Symmetry: C5
Subunit: 259 residues, 5 copies
């Protein structure tokens, strides 16, 4: 693809605003945005997590105004976590900090990740434990070998399905994603406190070093997200992953391209 | 509504200064700035927080001088939390950290938020637990379903009343607030320590990509805030939200529109 | 009305001094420490003795007398003197654990410094409006429940050393036009002290309009607090430990009218 | 060596992309990416860590296109740790935080290190304890004295062999490496939480203050790495180092050189 | 002294590169770089720390090429801590984290400090406890009074001797050191994790606001360092300061000067 002039004019600019909801497991009809209580396998060879216990990658494919050599180019992203203040509900079935204290807030291992792309995010598989049996209804590395625990190039996938790609198996494939801009932070640890900033005054630019943003094949924008905030501890002491939705505002413009 | 020239002169500039006091619960007439002690429901279904245990958003609507095409445009903000040294009272009915020790100071989950707009801050409701019964005298997401636990578009509101909107079920609506600038931080975890900076040498510019600040409809500036500093632990080991007031200094200039 | 800067001979001056911390000094051997912290059982019975209360430090520095012409503070260099003293973990310290070293000074800290052409101006805010502050100290008077968020009666001048309890007072952001102040409260019980020393860093004291503090009556006001944290003795009791602050201030001569 | 002009033209540039797997010990045929569980010595004299217990430096020598006097010059690096989300597997033979809680995630002492050079990374030896007996199959400071605990200049080597230079015995030698760019953080502490950022938008510049990058002797790129993420605690409470692979992408341009 | 022009020419440039070893106490002939295990006085009046238990400032007077009006002027500094990876030896007489665990790594109170100067570092004395009996063969504030615990102007010295000036009594005197540049962080707390960055791509400029670096009186350069990394806990539970060597590379140039 030869990228050429940006079209000028008011019809040359569009905008995509949406919410991408989390996919944490949802173990009952009252617990959307939570996973199942975590159960620990006794051995590696018996690691067998259920689907309702495994957070997955969120993805939304957004149709843009049809164009046809012109493609929509993603220029600017605005994004934030929606419902940060909900993590102050410290009075609903929380294990106490101590005797007569308030609930433990959501804390621990967090993954905050977001991508904007002209095609599906491209994933590479890395397994904590290759012998883990992943559940029916999820898409995960197949023919896992020991070498899957560090790097196995057989484990390529597209983020082509919502509620399907377990977070713990897949990362953005850094050998691809030319047409995607991705951003991710894992903050590990049992007690790591969530630090969530919100503002409507921060724009991130999506143009590569040559002034070129993601170009939207078949007039589709791809928004992908993960926002595992940490773990909710109930009074029994068992722990659930808790997630929040992510806001996306992408500005786009029309680029001419050849071949 | 198109934005044109900024009126110049010495009669074209105005300044708004004020304090927004925190609204933490005030469970008795000696505990202004504190909440009622947290009680934890045994289940989600039975979660029923009383008003005096629910911190709420602070809001002040300030009349500006009248202009009748001319609107007040907000340009610069100075803000800080007032009384940060108050958190050094570790000698007043606080649980000792160990045998013979000084008092645990205010710590744990904090929310520091401020916003300046030309209209009321626009809110999206999101709930930790959708079956939570919120109390009489508070304004909260109505018709909550399990989708409210992640994203429910029904839950829209304007921060149009003080001591009314509980911090825990409302957040600035990113899909709106085009005529407001907002900034907040949630610092979670039960041990996390307060980090409070203060200076009269720091200025936030309020203008957008296009050099335009909030334009004050009806000649009213709207200041909104939340300064939940953490929890204070009394010798019983029960915990109360403690908040502080926030200072605002806003500089406004005249703008012609339409 | 601020006019031209004078240039040439005797046009420049420097002020270099140290300000000692003011922590309580509870016996002739413990300068720079508070008394051990006693906790009151109730808010009602909170009665901290002067030797348990850290206070604001201040120095009125007299400048070369001028006769329309006044001194203008332009840059600051500052640091905490004797940071390495906090490596003494062998002098009557509660052991971390069995056979271990003494617990270092840690927990709640307040690092503040200001340079002004008049007394730093203070706002009173109280953790607990019922606290009885001791004779010999200057504290918010006629305290009410509203004093726990913002009571405009509590106004004062940092005009005396060892008198203004840190926990009652903050810089008043509605005034202090003729001062630059900077402060950090790092609260928490385990919070580690982080202290940077260098002779390579310079703060600029000029405002947005290129004007620094102007020294009324030819007097520079330096103000400071450096409560580093608490020292735990082998008994478990905790004292505030403070350290001295170094100020270097470059001033120039500014003509002024009316 | 006199560094002259850069050749231009579409064939004057090349790109190196690869993965560097962690060398953590691999104690059995199922635990690639893990160390052997740590065994403490009663005394400094008895300190005798086995090879399967000692994380080593990763190194890849990468042959570039032959030139016959031109040398390849490394200009830009893109790197990230691959599989950061694998550390969310807190349900596989993990010691519980507390009664009913999730597995403890990987946490504790981490070393994150990467270097790009036109020759093997140059190593200085420093020993926590000079009387440690290092194992057959590893290459370590020889003729240790007590001064090896602070600085002994006998302890020089080239990172010229994978799975062999123990990470705790060697460090980049700052008196050499004129022809290498190295970056490393040690975050020690027993409870220290991992912090892993991913993005395809960040580029390191490899040029020195004179606009010259590493020049590749015999047309070879040297990529060195260590990504000890922390330790994994099984249900017995014994602890293994857990390592992850590192992605490199280096842009190189042809430089003319004399002698 | 009037400062005039920089000299130019290949021979107006010189470079000083060297290691500063730590002076932690060296309690026995196997523990270079450790202190003696810490003992706590029952009272202030009885504080009497032994020399093998007190870390001291490190210093090196480096002779420069003899110039006979001309002085060498220090312009740039590269510095790093050497053997940061040595803090991953958690298998050598360390107190376990918990039952079956790896050893506690080095952690707790750290002081990292370095200075480059045209004369000896000037020290101000500050004592935690003015009644402390400092030991024979160390240089300490003398005729100490209670005022010595905050600020006593009597306590002035030159860091003119190695393994002599105990760290806890002395800090750079900020009323002096015009001809030195100093940099120091105290990170206190008992459990504080070491964060140690290494790279050969960072340079510090030693030039003040007027473009003048340290001027080396009598053709001498003064390099001072402290790098107490934290505390080592042996299986006893007793604790020793552990330090590491610091690397210095200083670029100097000739400067004319009058009187």
């Amino acid at each position: 693809v030869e990228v050429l002039e940006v079209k000028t004019g008011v019809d040359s600019i569009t905008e995509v605003e949406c919410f991408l909801t989390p996919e944490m497991g949802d173990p009952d009809e009252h617990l959307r945005g939570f996973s199942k209580s975590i159960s620990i396998s006794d051995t590696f060879e018996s690691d067998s997590p259920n689907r309702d216990m495994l957070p997955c990658y969120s993805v939304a494919r957004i149709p843009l105004p049809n164009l046809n050599i012109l493609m929509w180019e993603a220029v600017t992203l605005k994004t934030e976590v929606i419902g940060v203040t909900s993590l102050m509900n410290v009075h609903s079935n929380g294990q106490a900090t101590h005797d007569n204290g308030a609930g433990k807030p959501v804390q621990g291992t967090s993954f905050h990740f977001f991508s904007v792309g002209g095609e599906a995010l491209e994933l590479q598989g890395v397994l904590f434990n290759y012998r883990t049996k992943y559940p029916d209804g999820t898409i995960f590395p197949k023919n896992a070998t020991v070498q899957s625990q560090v790097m196995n190039t057989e484990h390529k996938a597209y983020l082509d399905k919502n509620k399907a790609y377990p977070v713990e198996c897949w990362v953005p494939d850094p050998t691809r994603n030319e047409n995607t801009r991705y951003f991710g932070t894992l903050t590990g640890g049992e007690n790591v406190p969530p630090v969530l900033h919100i503002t409507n005054t921060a724009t991130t630019v999506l143009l590569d070093e040559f002034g070129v943003g993601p170009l939207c094949k078949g007039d589709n924008l791809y928004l992908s997200a993960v926002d595992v905030c940490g773990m909710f501890t109930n009074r029994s002491g068992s722990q659930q992953w808790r997630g929040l939705s992510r806001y996306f505002k992408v500005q786009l413009r029309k680029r001419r391209v050849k071949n």
